[PDB]
Every structure is written in C-alpha cells, then in structure tokens.
Design a protein around this ligand. Structure first.
Ligand SMILES: Nc1ncnc2c1ncn2[C@@H]1O[C@H](COP(=O)(O)OP(=O)(O)O)[C@@H](O)[C@H]1O
Ligand SMILES: Nc1ncnc2c1ncn2[C@@H]1O[C@H](COP(=O)(O)OP(=O)(O)O)[C@@H](O)[C@H]1O
Ligand SMILES: Cc1ncc(CO)c(CO)c1O
Ligand SMILES: Cc1ncc(CO)c(CO)c1O
Ligand SMILES: [Ca+2]
Ligand SMILES: [Ca+2]
Ligand SMILES: [Ca+2]
Ligand SMILES: [Ca+2]
Ligand SMILES: [Ca+2]
Ligand SMILES: [Ca+2]
Ligand SMILES: [Ca+2]
Ligand SMILES: [Ca+2]
Ligand SMILES: [Cl-]
Lengths: 289, 295
C-alpha cells in the first residue's frame, strides 16, 4: 500500500505531543506509521520536569543505515517531520527525503510527499537555537507541504503574520524558498477577536500561479499542547484521498472536535476515535480572488 | 479511570513488535499507554540488519525520575513489560513496580497488576545473554501475570514444554517462583492446532486449556499483541475469558496478515502483522477461543 508514513517527531512516555499525537490518528486512517523518535522524554516541555534521551546525528544516520540495508526506503509514500530541535538532523532530513525519492523513482512508484512541520516555538517562545531556524529555511527548499504555526511562519519569512495580507506574504516567502503548498494553521485577528484564520497557499511550479484559500475556526480560550501535531497527521490522512482544500477542512474539524471535547491543555487523542476519522463538522475552506 | 498502562518494551521504526504492536490495540480499548522504549531500532531482530539505540540502566532511571517528579506513578493501574534484553533494567522493574504500588496505596487506589512477558527467544533460539534468563526468574517472583512462549517457559523452569503435561510442570515452577497467573501461549499429536495453558495458583491451582488453528509460517510480534490484548480484556473479564478473547484477536490478525500476502513462504516484511488493517477485530474478534477447565 501507499499508506506508509516515515514520521520523524518526538516520543514522550506521558501525554500527547509529536509521535504520541500523530501515530494513533494516522493508524485509525489505515496508515503504517514508521516513527523515528528524535527525543524519548518522560513528558512534553510544559511540565515542571523533563527527563530523557535526545538523538544526535549519529543515532539518526544509524537508524537510516538499518532502513537502507533492509530496502524499506521505497515504502514511504509520505514523510512527516515534526519536533527535531537539532540543526544537524534538520539538515540530514533533506538527504533522507532525497534517498526516499530516489528509491521510489527507481521502483517506479508515485513521488513521495514530504510534509515539513517546522517545529520551533509557540506562544512567542522559541524552543531551538537560531541555527535550527536557518536549518529549516534550507530544508523547506525540499518540502512538498509546510504546516508552520504563525510564529514559525513569522520567524522563517521575517513577516509578522497578524492578518490575511501578512499570512499571504509569509506563504509567498515559503513558495519562493521552494515549498509549493503551505498551511498557516491559525492566526488571531485584531479586527475579529472570536475567530482564528488559517491560510492554504498552493503555488503551481509550471504556471507560477498561486491558488489561495482561507477560512476560520472559533477562537477557544486556553492554551493547548499537540494541536499542530494532531493537525499535520490528520492533514496527511485526508490529503491522501481529498483535494488539499477539503483535506484542510476535515483536519480543522478534527481539531475543533478535540478542543471542544477537552473543554466539556492535554489533547485526549485516543478518547475520540470516530471524531478523528469523521469530524462532527468540516471548516469551510474557500478560494480567494 | 484506571485505564493507564506503563508499557516497557522495544520501539521499531519498521514493522510491528513491542510497544508498536502493543500500543494501538490498548489505545483502541480506551487505555492511555505510557511507553518506555527499551530500544529504538530500525526493525525487529529477525531481519539480516538491525540498527539503532539501546537504553542502559541510567537512561531507564532517568525516565523514571521524570515520571516520579511529575507524580505520574500512581496513575499506573497496569504495568506491562516485554522486550528489555538488559539484565540491569529487567532487575530494576521490581523496584519500579514496588514504587508504583506504594504511590497507589498512598493515594487510596486499588493495587496495580504487573504483566511480565519474559521476552528472551523463540523457535529454539535465545535473543538475550544467559544473564537476562536469571534476572527474569527473579523478576517473575514479583509478577502478577506472566505470558511466556513455550521456549521461555522451558528455559526459565528447565522443563522441556512439548505437551500439556510438561506445560503444567513448567507453570507449576512459575507458581512456586511466586507468579500466581501463567499463560503458556502455545505448544504442540495434532499438527493443525496449537494448545495453550492458563494456570492460576489457598495453595490450590485452577488450570485451563484450549486450542487455536496452527497457521504455517513464522510471525513476530504475536506475543506482544497477545499480552497487550490480555491486559485490555483482563481489565473487564475473568482471566479465562480474557485469554479466549486475546487468542481470537491473534487468529483474526494472523488471518488478515496471510490475507494481505503474509504466507509461510512470504518475506519478513509481508509477514509483519497487519496491526492497522482491522481495528474493530482488535476490539471485537470474529471468534473467541474456548478456555475449558481441566480436572
Ligand atoms: N485556541 C484555539 N481555538 C481553536 N482552534 C485552535 C486553538 N488552538 C489550536 N487550534 C486548532 O488546532 C490547530 C492548532 O495548531 P496551531 O496552534 O495553529 O499550531 P501549533 O499547535 O503547531 O502551534 C489550528 O489549525 C486550529 O484548528
Ligand atoms: N503460527 C501461528 N499460528 C496460529 N496462531 C499463532 C501462530 N503464532 C502465534 N499465534 C498466536 O499468537 C499467540 C502468541 O504467539 P506465541 O508464538 O505463543 O508467542 P511469541 O510471539 O511471544 O513467541 C498464540 O497464543 C496464538 O494465539
Ligand atoms: C517534545 C515536544 N514535541 C512536540 C511539541 C509540539 O507539540 C512540543 C511542544 O513543547 C514538545 O515539547
Ligand atoms: C526488537 C524486538 N522486539 C520484540 C520482539 C518480540 O516480538 C523481538 C523478537 O526478535 C524483537 O527483535
Ligand atoms: Ca523501471
Ligand atoms: Ca499554537
Ligand atoms: Ca500550543
Ligand atoms: Ca507545532
Ligand atoms: Ca512464537
Ligand atoms: Ca509474588
Ligand atoms: Ca515468532
Ligand atoms: Ca514473545
Ligand atoms: Cl484577516
């Protein structure tokens, strides 16, 4: 099957971020999730105490050696990258994707789709050294889809994402850098305080034309962990069989069901298995003129 | 709720063994799975090449310090151990389980159940040092439930498990060792069936047996899905029914693996269990194996 994802994200023993947020949703959708755990921690970065192991570049290339030696690299119709927070591994992902593209081409399979979630910060706070930011600018030259939060889109493009106009500028930066498809997952709007806006920006490499889509979700009170990780995983799942605009709509609806369930910080991903596959409602994703 | 498991097993990128095999079924049963990954490898040990990282004791005690400091230990109504292949970590599981039981007592919670799958070898081959065998003998004195394959039962007890009689002798060894509940998951007329033993030690022992169809071919991760399913069903079933349902889950999963190309003659990759293929069959097997009292 083509429902095979290499997922390069965090592992935590307790809670739902990185591969712990992404794996269950994708498996529910019928995907084999092949996870490389960039860290193996007790819990996410928000608890009072974080303990555990972080991969270095040598651990990453050792795992790749095993995948290469057993000829698994052509399995990966999708590559999903999340929390890495290591300059050398962010840079190495480009080689991993190129070796997957080569193995699939040699076996005459559909091109791999590389989804790059450039995980660096949230709520004004940066998790990574500045060298990681530039590593993501170079890696995004190779991505098919990028799913930055507004903070990541802002620091990568140097455009303050604060409304639809500035979101479009930040997205255009991603296109110029070489990412054809961008989802800016949410930004607040001074002029519409009860909603979050998202942008889907689709550059046609051949024509140079850009198809843009936007929509909103309700702006729920409170801070949530893992929202991006569930979002990107859900997007991969829906984008497998849906056009990207509809795939974004479903993925938004999945997050809205999860957040509203939490309300009636931690996303209880495994409590809502039917909502993960069939969200109680889809967000409208409408073309822009 | 008490549907929280601390699961101490292997992580593989490719394929379905250890925590990757155990996690999805337990999550489908509504459990939070807190996984400690004893190794993070490219694939299971059956492949010609196996690459990646292995925990030492210090890495294990480091994660444990995180779980302790954040007051997570009292949440673990269940402890499930599988692939460790490290004498010092196997030894350390007794102290981990003891600390969970004390944190649970302190908070007015019912006692935990520790399920010990003593993962050491299969098809007559050890995949661990002789050191790990003895560490399992000593951990098993602290286990509530043990789920050896017939090889593991054989080397732990030093009884050759080849029939119902010898399986009973091996299970008796586990009970004398201190393990009240033993499932010997399969053994050898009638070449088309495998037999299993459930033995529950008041000094008296209740024993049960049953059969499943024997599918030709070598599967890996079968024990890992089985123990995971046993934990899920045993939470709301008596142990005989929970074994019956876990056996049914495995028959469905092996049939789906064969259905999607996983013949006896097929590749290691083709024989990888189709864990994602039929999620409803992981919760609700199409058959439930009979588990019938012995006299
Ligand atoms: N407070 C919120 N109210 C509504 N939806 C939210 C909220 N926070 C997150 N989301 C949803 O989940 C996704 C959250 O990811 P976002 O915060 O944009 O990314 P990240 O978690 O990577 O920072 C959004 O696209 C949106 O659907
Ligand atoms: N070849 C097989 N044919 C039928 N059932 C099998 C086969 N291999 C495993 N099983 C099922 O999987 C369960 C666990 O398998 P077993 O081989 O006993 O453990 P392990 O995988 O730990 O060696 C068995 O109880 C049985 O239900
Ligand atoms: C380890 C780890 N992985 C992923 C994320 C993003 O949800 C975070 C956010 O803090 C994190 O700490
Ligand atoms: C890594 C790893 N984990 C688990 C198991 C048992 O299925 C094996 C069997 O060889 C293994 O190699
Ligand atoms: Ca060709
Ligand atoms: Ca956010
Ligand atoms: Ca957040
Ligand atoms: Ca994020
Ligand atoms: Ca076996
Ligand atoms: Ca005992
Ligand atoms: Ca086997
Ligand atoms: Ca086993
Ligand atoms: Cl706007």
């Amino acid at each position: 099957d083509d429902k095979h994802v290499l997922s390069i994200q965090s592992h935590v023993t307790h809670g739902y971020v990185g591969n712990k947020a992404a794996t269950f949703p994708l498996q529910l959708h019928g995907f084999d999730v092949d996870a490389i755990n960039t860290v193996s921690l007790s819990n996410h970065s928000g608890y009072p105490v974080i303990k555990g192991h972080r991969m270095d570049l040598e651990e990453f290339t050792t795992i790749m050696e095993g995948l290469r030696a057993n000829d698994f690299l052509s399995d990966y119709a999708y590559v999903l990258t999340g929390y890495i927070n290591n300059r050398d591994i962010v840079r190495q992902v480009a080689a991993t994707v190129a070796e997957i593209r080569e193995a699939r081409q040699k076996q005459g399979k559909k091109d791999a789709v590389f989804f790059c979630d450039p995980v660096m910060g949230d709520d004004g706070r940066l998790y990574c050294k500045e060298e990681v930011v530039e590593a993501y600018r170079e890696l995004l030259t190779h991505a098919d889809v990028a799913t930055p939060n507004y903070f990541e889109a802002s620091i990568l493009s140097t455009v303050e994402v604060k409304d639809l106009a500035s979101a479009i500028e930040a997205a255009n930066w991603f296109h110029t850098q070489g990412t054809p498809t961008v989802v800016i997952k949410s930004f607040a709007m001074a002029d519409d305080p009860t909603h979050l806006r998202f942008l889907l920006s689709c550059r046609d490499k051949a024509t140079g034309s850009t198809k843009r889509y936007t929509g909103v979700v309700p702006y729920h009170e409170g801070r949530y962990t893992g929202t991006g990780d569930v979002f990107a995983a859900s997007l991969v799942a829906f984008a497998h069989s849906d056009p990207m605009d509809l795939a974004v709509g479903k993925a938004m609806g999945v997050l809205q069901d999860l957040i509203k369930a939490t309300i009636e910080r931690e996303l209880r991903v495994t409590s809502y298995p039917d909502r993960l596959q069939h969200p109680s409602s889809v967000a409208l994703v409408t073309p822009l003129p």
